[PDB]
Structure 1
Amino acid sequence: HHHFNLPPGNYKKPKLLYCSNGGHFLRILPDGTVDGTRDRSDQHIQLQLSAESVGEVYIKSTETGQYLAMDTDGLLYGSQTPNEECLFLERLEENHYNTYISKKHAEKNWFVGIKKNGSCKRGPRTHYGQKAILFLPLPV
């Protein structure tokens, strides 16, 4: 369903997923809530990525152990355990950024994304070409 241009990073260390849209870091709150925050000091923005298969990743909160996941209705949530909804296709975009496509909903082009207001986007509302889906992994 999708191209295979991969980004040039590794999963050695945790990262911050900086969204260029509004400048928010992706956050997985203890209650399972997922949003974005501009507070670099937030304890819930440190994520450990890991590769399942080449180009397939898990995105986990170092603080809580929760996995980033996208539900049947396109809502991002924090999962206590790894499941099919937790896999994302990590790809390069615009020869620069990282994008994360829901593996489970790949055919539909549902992406991880953050609005200028700090609220995450719902799967069906995302699409190729948007600013909300563009991320830069920053060191913690």
Structure 2
Amino acid sequence: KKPKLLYCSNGGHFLRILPDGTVDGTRDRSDQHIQLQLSAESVGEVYIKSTETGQYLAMDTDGLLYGSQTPNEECLFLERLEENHYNTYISKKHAEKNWFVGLKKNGSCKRGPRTHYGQKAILFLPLPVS
């Protein structure tokens, strides 16, 4: 649990949270906002924070991901390992809606209600930073 990169296979991107709270993905290994710290706030729960800006990955009430300055309830995710050995993170708040953290092929954040268990857009591979 050192700063990791959240690599999404659908499109091959690095999930990232911009200074202005925008969350999306990118292919530049040199991006200053792709370094995330993953705090485990319980047995299968986690917090994902932009070390570069302090912001925490959070999903609003409509499934849109954004960067929150404080770590509220909307910032927890149930980190799960899947079949092909990837990690998928589903919003704990909306767990019942099956809303995950995901990236579209073109690297733009994939809306929570547009994601679903099984989709390749929800697969992330933590890679080592620096």
Q: TM-score range by the shorter chain?
A: over 0.9
C-alpha displacement of 1:79: 0.2
Cα displacement string for residues 86-132 of structure 1 (whole angstroms, at most 9, x for unaligned residues): 00000001140000000000001100000110101111000011010
Distance 1:93 1:66 in 2: 27
Deviations 1:18-50 (A, max 9, x none): 001100000000000000000000000000001
* Structure 1: gaps of 5 or more residues: 1-11
Residue number in structure 1 paired with 2:125: 136
Q: Distance in 2 between matches of 1:129 and 1:106?
A: 15
Partner of 2:5: 16
Q: List per-residue Cα deviations over 1:61-81 (Å, max 9, x = no partner).
A: 010000000000110000000
Report percent identity of matched pairs.
99
Is 1:125 the counterpart of 2:111? The answer is no
Mark the runs of 5 or more structure 2 residues left unpaired by the alignment. none
The Cα offsets for residues 4-31 of structure 1, whole Å up to 9 and x where unpaired, read as xxxxxxxx20100000110000000000
TM-score normalized with structure 1 length: 0.91
Q: Aligned pair count? A: 129
Q: How does 1:1-140 map to 2 (within 5 A)?
A: 12-140=1-129
Q: 1:95/1:116 Cα in 2 relative to 1: closer, same or farther (>3 Å)?
A: closer
For residues 19 and 95 of structure 1, the distance between their equivalents in structure 2, rounded to whole angstroms, comes to 13
CA distance in structure 2 between the aligned counterparts of 1:89 and 1:17, rounded to whole angstroms: 15
Give the distance between the partners of 1:128 and 1:100, measured in 2 at CA. 10
* Aligned structure 1 segments of 4 or more residues deviating by more than 3 angstroms: none
Q: Counterparts of 2:104 and 2:80 in 1: how far apart (Å)?
A: 20
